[PDB]
Amino acid sequence: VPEIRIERIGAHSHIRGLGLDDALEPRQASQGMVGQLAARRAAGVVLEMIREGKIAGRAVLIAGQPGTGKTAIAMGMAQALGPDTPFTAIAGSEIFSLEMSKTEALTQAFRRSIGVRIKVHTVSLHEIDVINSRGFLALFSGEIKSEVREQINAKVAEWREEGKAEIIPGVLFIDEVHMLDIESFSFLNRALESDMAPVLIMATNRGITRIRGTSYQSPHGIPIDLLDRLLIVSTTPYSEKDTKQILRIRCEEEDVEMSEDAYTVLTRIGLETSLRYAIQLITAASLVCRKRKGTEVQVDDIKRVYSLFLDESRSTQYMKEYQDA
């Protein structure tokens, strides 16, 4: 057989681990992470569990309002587990696909979180599968066989036996876990009971919500059997200085130079709406400033971009107020 998302788009490239260290004591500056000491400490406890081997059969859940850094914590724990650990970051809505049934999608997600090291090259098992499966647009052109995966599993067993490969349990992140129904939760519960099983992090921003596929309401829309085997970590919303530092490091990452008044107005904008909308505004502001032959982004550019592109709350409220007639 032949051999060799979040990183490609960005928005999480600056986080090189949790950075707490000092024997499980959160550091304010740390390795990219800013604030949220309690969630980071709980995550570090989770790493300690994984390293000692006391996580088998359990899983991690992260709650909080959107824009608080659940994916940041997941990426931090992925980085802290090792230099080349796999990290998949799927959503709850990506298991409803026209081509792949929920079983195939969830299996693909799981095999995208079981890395193999070859002597050093680290490759995902599902990447190995896709390599052993037969135009510059093939992403247009799933269902990657049923026997090829068995053959690759046998070959991986052989590669473990004679010593040419090493198995690395990665991290699988499911954003908005309330999207999954009781069908997929059973698959998750059954799949966790394996020796080669990735750590499973779920994220949610919803409280009491009806389980999809059933009629009974449960916390976070998760069945009780799984909910009693979860380490729930709560993330508090950011404050002014934390988001200011986040914007600063992000701008340093995407090569944007900005003034202080623009920084504070951007921080206030992000405080009102979201970290993601404020982050989105940065590239548009930089491109607007380039047209006006300006090197440093002023605050009036922030004015222009905030007037041009709308946030979600305003966009929804405007047209809800439209339907009054």
């Binding site: 107005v265 004015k303 905030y306 007037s307 405007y318 107020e321």
Partner: peptide, 23 residues
């Protein structure tokens, strides 16, 4: 009025009030 305040409209008249006193 609802939440329609932007930079231009607020200056013309001179939920989204305290946020509006930063631009």
């Amino acid at each position: 009025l609802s939440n329609k305040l932007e930079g231009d409209t607020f200056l013309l008249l001179i939920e989204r009030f305290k946020m509006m006193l930063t631009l």
